[PDB]
Design a protein around this ligand. Structure first.
Ligand SMILES: [Ca+2]
Length: 185
């Protein structure tokens, strides 16, 4: 089987789907990675919970979270015919709204540290606000292109970098619906 089937890391098997440190001691601001039912709702039972603690004196309080597309560590994945990577992030709105500063993220195919996209200065007023299980969440949703030069066999590590920007936020950030897609961005 050589396909261009969508690769959908939605945590719906109730595992972390190979998410963890991108390299030794890389998690840093991310104090725990777990599979969580906190956002359990019709059609969507599990998400990846990242317990973070940012320091408000640190302008770039980074941590790096990786997964292996295919689960095989130091495996290659053939990105031929894949054109975008999509994801959603959820941050509890009331707690995040009380925090100072903001946070940034990068989405990277880590074969030569190739950034697909990034955003900075995320606060509770970014994206959209959605109520889940009694609680409002700030929701970030983006699709970034896989550039044509990377649509080939590459080291199969997808990395999410998170960085506190003079933030004092201490709480979960949830990741869900990470898709490596044949569709364009
Ligand atoms: Ca899910």
């Amino acid at each position: 089987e050589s396909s261009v089937n969508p690769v959908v890391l939605d945590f719906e098997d109730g595992t972390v789907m190979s998410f963890g440190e991108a390299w030794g001691d890389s998690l840093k601001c991310i104090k725990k990675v777990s599979v969580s039912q906190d956002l359990q709702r019709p059609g969507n039972k599990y998400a990846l919970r990242l317990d973070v603690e940012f320091n408000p004196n640190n302008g770039w309080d980074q941590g790096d979270l990786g997964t292996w597309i295919g689960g095989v560590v130091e495996g290659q994945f053939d990105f031929t015919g894949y054109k975008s990577v999509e994801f959603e992030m959820f941050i509890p709105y009331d707690e995040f709204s009380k925090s100072q500063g903001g946070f940034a993220y990068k989405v990277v195919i880590n074969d030569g540290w190739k950034e697909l996209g990034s955003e900075f200065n995320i606060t509770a007023n970014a994206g959209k606000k959605v109520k889940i299980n009694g609680k409002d969440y700030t929701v970030i949703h983006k699709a970034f292109a896989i550039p044509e030069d990377f649509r080939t066999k590459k080291r199969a590590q997808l990395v999410f970098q998170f960085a506190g920007q003079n933030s004092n936020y201490k709480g979960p950030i949830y990741l869900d619906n990470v898709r490596i897609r044949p569709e364009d961005a």
